[PDB]
Amino acid sequence: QPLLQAIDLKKHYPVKKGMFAPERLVKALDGVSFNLERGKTLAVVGESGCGKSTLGRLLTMIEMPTGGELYYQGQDLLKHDPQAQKLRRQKIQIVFQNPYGSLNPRKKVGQILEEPLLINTSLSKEQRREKALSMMAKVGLKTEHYDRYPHMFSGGQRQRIAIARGLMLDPDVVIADQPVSALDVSVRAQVLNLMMDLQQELGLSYVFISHDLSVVEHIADEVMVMYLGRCVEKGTKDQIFNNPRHPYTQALLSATPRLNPDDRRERIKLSGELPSPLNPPPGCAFNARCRRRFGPCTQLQPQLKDYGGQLVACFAVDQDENPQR
Amino acid sequence: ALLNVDKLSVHFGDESAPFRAVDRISYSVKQGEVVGIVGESGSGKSVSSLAIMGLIDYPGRVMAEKLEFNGQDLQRISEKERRNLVGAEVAMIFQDPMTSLNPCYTVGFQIMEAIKVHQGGNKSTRRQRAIDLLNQVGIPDPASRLDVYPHQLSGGMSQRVMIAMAIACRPKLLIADQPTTALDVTIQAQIIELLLELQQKENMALVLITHDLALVAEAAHKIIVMYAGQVVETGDAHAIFHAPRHPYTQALLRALPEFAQDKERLASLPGVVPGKYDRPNGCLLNPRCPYATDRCRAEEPALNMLADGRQSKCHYPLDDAGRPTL
Amino acid sequence: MLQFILRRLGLVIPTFIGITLLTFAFVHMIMWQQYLHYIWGVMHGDLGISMKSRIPVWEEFVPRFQATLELGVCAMIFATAVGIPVGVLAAVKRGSIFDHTAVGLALTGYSMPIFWWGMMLIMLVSVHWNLTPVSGRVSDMVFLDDSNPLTGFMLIDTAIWGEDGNFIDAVAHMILPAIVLGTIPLAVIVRMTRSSMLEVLGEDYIRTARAKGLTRMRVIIVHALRNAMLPVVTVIGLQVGTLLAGAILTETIFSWPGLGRWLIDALQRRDYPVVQGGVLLVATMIILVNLLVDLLYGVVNPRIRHKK
Amino acid sequence: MTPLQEFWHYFKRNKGAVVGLVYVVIVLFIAIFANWIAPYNPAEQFRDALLAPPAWQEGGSMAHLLGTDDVGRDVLSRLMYGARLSLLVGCLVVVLSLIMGVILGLIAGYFGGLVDNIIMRVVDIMLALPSLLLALVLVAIFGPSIGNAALALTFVALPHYVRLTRAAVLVEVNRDYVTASRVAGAGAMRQMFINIFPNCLAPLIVQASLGFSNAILDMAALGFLGMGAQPPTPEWGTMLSDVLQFAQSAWWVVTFPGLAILLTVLAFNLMGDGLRDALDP
Ligand SMILES: Nc1ncnc2c1ncn2[C@@H]1O[C@H](COP(=O)(O)OP(=O)(O)NP(=O)(O)O)[C@@H](O)[C@H]1O
Ligand code: SF4
Numbered sequence A: 001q002p003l004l005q006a007i008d009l010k011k012h013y014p015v016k017k018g019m020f021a022p023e024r025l026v027k028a029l030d031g032v033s034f035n036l037e038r039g040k041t042l043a044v045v046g047e048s049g050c051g052k053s054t055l056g057r058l059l060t061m062i063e064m065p066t067g068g069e070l071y072y073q074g075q076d077l078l079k080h081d082p083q084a085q086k087l088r089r090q091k092i093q094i095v096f097q098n099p100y101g102s103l104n105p106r107k108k109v110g111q112i113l114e115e116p117l118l119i120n121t122s123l124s125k126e127q128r129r130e131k132a133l134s135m136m137a138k139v140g141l142k143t144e145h146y147d148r149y150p151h152m153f154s155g156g157q158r159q160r161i162a163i164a165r166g167l168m169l170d171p172d173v174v175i176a177d178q179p180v181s182a183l184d185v186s187v188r189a190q191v192l193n194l195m196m197d198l199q200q201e202l203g204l205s206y207v208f209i210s211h212d213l214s215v216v217e218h219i220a221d222e223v224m225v226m227y228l229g230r231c232v233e234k235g236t237k238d239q240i241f242n243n244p245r246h247p248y249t250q251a252l253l254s255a256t257p258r259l260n261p262d263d264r265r266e267r268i269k270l271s272g273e274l275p276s277p278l279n280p281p282p283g284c285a286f287n288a289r290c291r292r293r294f295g296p297c298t299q300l301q302p303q304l305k306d307y308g309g310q311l312v313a314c315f316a317v318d319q320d321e322n323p324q325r
Numbered sequence B: 001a002l003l004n005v006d007k008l009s010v011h012f013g014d015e016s017a018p019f020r021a022v023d024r025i026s027y028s029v030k031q032g033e034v035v036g037i038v039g040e041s042g043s044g045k046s047v048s049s050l051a052i053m054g055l056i057d058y059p060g061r062v063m064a065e066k067l068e069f070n071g072q073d074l075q076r077i078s079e080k081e082r083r084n085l086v087g088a089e090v091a092m093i094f095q096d097p098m099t100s101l102n103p104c105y106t107v108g109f110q111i112m113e114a115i116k117v118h119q120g121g122n123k124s125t126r127r128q129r130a131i132d133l134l135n136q137v138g139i140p141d142p143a144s145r146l147d148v149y150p151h152q153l154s155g156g157m158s159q160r161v162m163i164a165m166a167i168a169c170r171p172k173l174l175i176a177d178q179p180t181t182a183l184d185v186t187i188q189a190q191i192i193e194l195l196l197e198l199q200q201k202e203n204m205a206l207v208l209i210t211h212d213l214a215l216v217a218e219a220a221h222k223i224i225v226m227y228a229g230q231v232v233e234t235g236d237a238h239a240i241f242h243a244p245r246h247p248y249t250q251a252l253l254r255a256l257p258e259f260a261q262d263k264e265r266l267a268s269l270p271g272v273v274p275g276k277y278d279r280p281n282g283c284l285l286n287p288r289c290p291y292a293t294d295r296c297r298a299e300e301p302a303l304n305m306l307a308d309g310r311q312s313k314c315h316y317p318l319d320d321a322g323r324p325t326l
Numbered sequence C: 001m002l003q004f005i006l007r008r009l010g011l012v013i014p015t016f017i018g019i020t021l022l023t024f025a026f027v028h029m030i031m032w033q034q035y036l037h038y039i040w041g042v043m044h045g046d047l048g049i050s051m052k053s054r055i056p057v058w059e060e061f062v063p064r065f066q067a068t069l070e071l072g073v074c075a076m077i078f079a080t081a082v083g084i085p086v087g088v089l090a091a092v093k094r095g096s097i098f099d100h101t102a103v104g105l106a107l108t109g110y111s112m113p114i115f116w117w118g119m120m121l122i123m124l125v126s127v128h129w130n131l132t133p134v135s136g137r138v139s140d141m142v143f144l145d146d147s148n149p150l151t152g153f154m155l156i157d158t159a160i161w162g163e164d165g166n167f168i169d170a171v172a173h174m175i176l177p178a179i180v181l182g183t184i185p186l187a188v189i190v191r192m193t194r195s196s197m198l199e200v201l202g203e204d205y206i207r208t209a210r211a212k213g214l215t216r217m218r219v220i221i222v223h224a225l226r227n228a229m230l231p232v233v234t235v236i237g238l239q240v241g242t243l244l245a246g247a248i249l250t251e252t253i254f255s256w257p258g259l260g261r262w263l264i265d266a267l268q269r270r271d272y273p274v275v276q277g278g279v280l281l282v283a284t285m286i287i288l289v290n291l292l293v294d295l296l297y298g299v300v301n302p303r304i305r306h307k308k
Numbered sequence D: 001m002t003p004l005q006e007f008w009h010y011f012k013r014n015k016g017a018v019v020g021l022v023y024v025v026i027v028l029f030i031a032i033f034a035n036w037i038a039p040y041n042p043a044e045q046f047r048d049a050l051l052a053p054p055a056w057q058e059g060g061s062m063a064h065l066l067g068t069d070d071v072g073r074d075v076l077s078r079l080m081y082g083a084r085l086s087l088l089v090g091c092l093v094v095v096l097s098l099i100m101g102v103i104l105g106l107i108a109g110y111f112g113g114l115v116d117n118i119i120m121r122v123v124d125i126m127l128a129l130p131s132l133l134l135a136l137v138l139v140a141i142f143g144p145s146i147g148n149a150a151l152a153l154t155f156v157a158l159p160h161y162v163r164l165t166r167a168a169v170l171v172e173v174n175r176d177y178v179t180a181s182r183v184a185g186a187g188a189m190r191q192m193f194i195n196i197f198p199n200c201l202a203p204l205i206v207q208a209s210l211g212f213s214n215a216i217l218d219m220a221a222l223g224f225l226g227m228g229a230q231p232p233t234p235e236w237g238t239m240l241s242d243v244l245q246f247a248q249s250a251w252w253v254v255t256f257p258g259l260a261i262l263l264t265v266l267a268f269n270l271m272g273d274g275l276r277d278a279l280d281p
């Protein structure tokens, strides 16, 4: 039983083109599924509007899904029962993209860290402070920082406070919504080192959401590539960065810049711009942009299939692997 | 050289204790050259560009020995004569494409205004030129695009309009401050590709300033590395990221995932960038540097010109083995 | 634009039905279908009889509405024509002696008791310096021949059908009322024009305007002032609503024929029919002015105009 | 620095603000200790002197510093007792309109939905008629008196504070720290009063000082029109009720009550922009 099962998660927000128009669904997420196991990072990669941050919000129940199943160790988290609410509130936690907006600017760092323990635990004030001090210690802040306001800290130190608040209930899963994107190179390195040291000590699993493929290449174990709310390709890090099968994965891994002249790759020349989810194209969502476009691609929606242990959704790969078509 | 910055300095605040946002920097740009400027927050990259453009406002003060562009001293020319250069021989693209265009006027007004101020001409010829110029940046259906307000564009389309508006009068130098932050990876590849096709077709110099070293290593010929408001290394793109001569450049590379053997821990420097009150005596990296020695606290390092043609602001420039030449 | 203006109508109608129900509660208490009969009364013009005059509230309202509208447009023409240039100039010259003087005088005008300011100007520039007339909309020397198709607007009627000097009387009586009433509008417009201009002069599109090599004039007039006038349009709407509070105060000391003097006299004499009907006629006109201003904001602002 | 000392260090940059605060302090000390400081009782009619000039003007008397009104009462003692009633009504108007208005604005902004529609349509109906005209309608129905004027002013000032609190709360509720506490398990009473309220407090401290300005202007206006306080009461508005007849006979009677009002309101507006300057980066 994997630590977290997602089965067919869907998020279909409804919208109005003004008063007189009929309601229409923006299918912001459709049909994602994964197994996450204890001590591993699963990475979600894709450009803007791919659904990657409506996912994560579903996994932490900031927003309720419009279909699918979400199991922690065989217990369905999507039940409304208070007996299940306590479990999901302890076990699954989030670190947000913005270090300036995710901390309350009129509370002391001690209060930002004690708030989770007031709400969820029996602990007296004397015990609560020792958990907060020991957690600041674990993320590399000082005891003297306890009384300071978040405006007294650098962007890197603010992300360490956000991580410490997440870790405060001793979780098993941390969702990380683009967590080092706003940071400079030398402080990005320290926040990445910290997150991997916490995975070695606590045994956390991360669902890590990122537009930077370098960092994913660095930290991830499995990768999900997403386009227009659907997964396009899923596999181990080794497969995705050495034998990418999907035309969009091949485009991301070539549009990503690299230092070493020996690490250059074939240039793939994507035209146009990302489809609006409010006006989605028929068939495969990449058919407006794909080099490999074939007869089925404008008619039918591709589904993930297993090719050599790597899942991919593409009618051209189906024809490469089954020449009988 | 097309541009000749010499001992440029830019200060903010009271003259008894100034914030040295740029501190005695000196660099040059040749015709048709692509120059990268790289450095983390607080490094001062943008302030040299804003000083050439005259965009440093009332609390800030620009001092230099030589700030020649195209043979014109940008510190001695009048406001009349500065407006003959800015937007017509030197032009600039900025970081946020969603706010860089004026909300209240169409894309076509904003391009046709730039043509009017430097080249004049009737409505017909200015429209035709905006059409051609939107064609040149790869806009789909230019004609129908002129009457489009900025809130109707995407971020990538809005950078393409900024490039169109900047190249309108055929400048000799194009400056780009982080043109691809907060923009998607496949759009970033298109924008840098477009700027490099324009650098080849128009023969213009391109100064490309960013925090991402990998983008610059692909695009640029020559790279300038900035720390704490001053230049710390200058050299060819191919060499600077393979045998770095300054300890900051070495650390800035070893902190990138590119050199990580899978899960092996990344290197970093201790400490933080020296802002207004934290300025060290001697070398500015001295609070942080692995190789620090007493000379580096007594005496500020010269920008030493090395035998391979590169420059390093260090007393003990790194050998090819990555160790100080004590 | 339709999917914007139709939502402004969608907020106006519940507000308007509200004022008809609350004024119904007031005329009933001083057969739910008695509300349908009362709004039939309102729509057929059958507002009550004023207890002292014994004349219908509508027959009294019309002349005084006119007389209030002259003074209102003069107060706003003064406040907008003086205020916007001073606000632009102050923001363009930030920290200058001009900027401090403009901020200080705008605080002084926004803090001022309007009735007292009128008494000080009456005392100074009609009693001690004998420069302006002390009261009234026009002097007793003006007698317009009724046979002519008079508009009821004294500036217009005396310009077209007056004898020699009668228009000069009609303007000389109006300048003190307009300056006194227009002082709070002018103070709000100078303040809101500065703050709106200074936030705009910080925006990245003005860095682009200077980077294009434009003259400072084009940067202020063309690029800055259009973005800065969006909030100015807004507050001008709040002022042309709230202006009738200044009318009650100014019309009393200046003995002006006007809605402010007719309403406060009715309140002091407990002539409930005038205040019961006049609250409906004031509140409906506030709703129409707000509705027009929102339509103006919709055409000016291209984020609202072009979205749908 | 600590938030209180950082506030003062920034507030002290605005000299005008300091001037205003000085003034404020001064008039509050006059308002408290009026019974000891003021020369004569507010109601005492002299008759050996009647409409006599200020102490420096010829035919005036140095016994009555700011001269005398038409029924023989000293202007200086009356201005000081006017200060009591004007600042006391400012306190009730601002304190009750903050308490009721901030609660309704948080209830409207956080819970949203039907509750927001009911609150905001009621506030929009309440603003469909000008401030002073709605207060006059209330006071004429219930009766002219200082208490009825203070209550009418609290009721009319309320919608402004509701609308301003809601506008601040909707800017906070979308921010990630409100979501983070919602995921952590915080209930609505905690989210409103322990998390959102201290973040939206910055505008309300500005609007408290700008609220004193409108409270004493509208109370003076009410007084002037004979609705706010009755003729014997020493109130700055009432003192100007019927004075325009004296524009030739006695300039002091028309001048000093309104100059005092202007000074007071200007002082509080000075503090208002001083607080604004101290509460943004
Ligand atoms: N509450 C919402 N109602 C309607 N559409 C929404 C809502 N939230 C997000 N969307 C749309 O859902 C699509 C994708 O969701 P979003 O989380 O924004 O994408 P992402 O790729 O995960 N993150 P980002 O990089 O910021 O675009 C976009 O078209 C959004 O505009
Ligand atoms: S399904 Fe067709 S259009 Fe889609 S990625 Fe595969 S080949 Fe391209």
Ligand code: SF4
Residues within 6 Å of the ligand: B247, B248, B283, B284, B285, B286, B289, B290, B291, B292, B293, B296, B301, B313, B314, B315, B316
């Ligand atoms: S000059 Fe000295 S302190 Fe500076 S980088 Fe080199 S070795 Fe380090």
